[PDB]
Amino acid sequence: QGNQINFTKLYLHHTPAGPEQNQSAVTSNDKKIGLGCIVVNNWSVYDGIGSDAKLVAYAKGLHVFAGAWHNSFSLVFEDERLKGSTLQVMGLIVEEGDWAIVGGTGQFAMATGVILKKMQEQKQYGNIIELTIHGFCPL
Amino acid sequence: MLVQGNQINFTKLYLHHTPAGPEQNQSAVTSNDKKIGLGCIVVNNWSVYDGIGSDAKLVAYAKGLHVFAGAWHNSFSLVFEDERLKGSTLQVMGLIVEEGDWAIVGGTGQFAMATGVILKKMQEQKQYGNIIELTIHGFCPL
Amino acid sequence: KLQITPCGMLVQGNQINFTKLYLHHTPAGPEQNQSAVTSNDKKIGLGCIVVNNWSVYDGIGSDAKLVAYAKGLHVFAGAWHNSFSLVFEDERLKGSTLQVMGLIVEEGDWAIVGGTGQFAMATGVILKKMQEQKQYGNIIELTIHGFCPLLKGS
Ligand SMILES: [Ca+2]
Ligand SMILES: [Cl-]
Ligand SMILES: [Cl-]
Ligand SMILES: [Cl-]
Ligand SMILES: [Cl-]
Ligand SMILES: [Cl-]
């Protein structure tokens, strides 16, 4: 009938360059049209900032540049409490704005909600994005 | 039990699907495999207008991709441009570009957690593209 | 025109009741039904995109009637992430689709993220169980659990 979501703040490592690069462009923009670059991403997601943070999930999917980045990815949890579960995520922009939680699996079967993105830290080779998960699942 | 929300009905939107020509608004970045007959991937930034006439205002973009798997499977963000609806999106997924239906699989902003369908009907067939009438039927929980 | 109308929704309004389906995942051979169209980046270990038109049957015998196709793509980002339309063939179910998205082709689970026609607003999951491994592909058993909500109020 309704159960909300019990997360703290997550921090996604969006790293396009450097020796820890976790995404790759597989097509280029059409120069005439101004779109078409497709990037495939395996973004690590941590439970905090700093060397003591634990990796709790990966964001595995793709984003395509259609004048802005459209995303589709599986948020696959690795921490023991949620291992076996995913949230399915889709929407616009990587580093700010919102994404939609369009479904899920495991403990998140039938999840619906949103993920709010805020810039947390800009590093040399990438950035860290604060994720705030709001949503619910039916019981 | 029940989830309080708002049913959302949006009529008379017109999507400009323009594969070619000076107003081309999508690009194929892969080709169909010769032997299997599938594989073309097209990235699209389709404009969506509030009317068919000369005075129609652009009110959204459909930003995403579609892939040819014997028919075209679509995944995109319908991003609204009205300073009113600014930022808010509907997340759209499904088969066929010019006819049939798409699923509304989620949303953001004023359309957070949207669920529903988009109905497509071709309105005008032109030399380099077509105009597709869209009808949105959706529900957003509060 | 944008019409915003107060309404109620019951999620368990209409359960999606199917029998078991059987998906044919065939990467090679004379019945190959998918193609890889981008390459993995060797430096990063990800990037390959495959476009698929998987056939789906209602049984494992020769008299199994094809009832659907799974039309979409999967992308390798350390694991295969899937996005496809499940397009049904039979009359009454003609035109109707389930929208499916999630990780892994042959095991685990997928989300039902939406639908059209009779499956408008579908929500749920598809469980995958390996059913048979053949020379050019495998057959995957599909178990559908989900609901279509009914709207009320207004
Ligand atoms: Ca959904
Ligand atoms: Cl990026
Ligand atoms: Cl963007
Ligand atoms: Cl082609
Ligand atoms: Cl089509
Ligand atoms: Cl996999």
Residue numbers in the entry:
A (entry chain C): 17 to 155
B (entry chain A): 14 to 155
C (entry chain B): 6 to 159
The authors write:
The isolated DIR domain of OsJAC1 presents as a trimer in the asymmetric unit of both crystal forms, featuring C3-symmetry with the same mode of interaction among constituent chains. All OsJAC1 DIR protomers show the canonical eight-stranded antiparallel β-barrel fold known from structurally characterized homologs. These show signs of enhanced dynamics, exhibiting different degrees of disorder in the crystal structures. In either model, chain B has the highest amino acid sequence coverage. Interestingly, residues Lys6–Thr10 were found hydrogen-bonded to Gln20–Thr24 of an adjacent chain (chain A in cf1) in the same trimer, adding an extra antiparallel strand to the neighboring β-barrel. Similar to the JRL domain dimer, the DIR domain trimer is categorized as a stable assembly by PISA; the solvent-accessible surface buried at the binary interfaces amounts to approximately 900 Å2 per subunit, increasing to above 1400 Å2 if the swapped β-strand is considered. The OsJAC1-DIR domain revealed an eight-stranded antiparallel β-barrel fold with a wide-open putative binding area, which is surrounded by five loops.
A protein involved in resistance against different pathogen groups, which is only present in monocot plants, is referred to as monocot chimeric jacalin (MCJ). As its name suggests, it is a fusion of two proteins, a jacalin-related lectin (JRL) and a dirigent protein (DIR) at the N-terminus. Therefore, the development of disease resistant plants is mandatory. It was shown that the rice (Oryza sativa) protein OsJAC1 enhances resistance against different bacterial and fungal plant pathogens in rice, barley, and wheat.
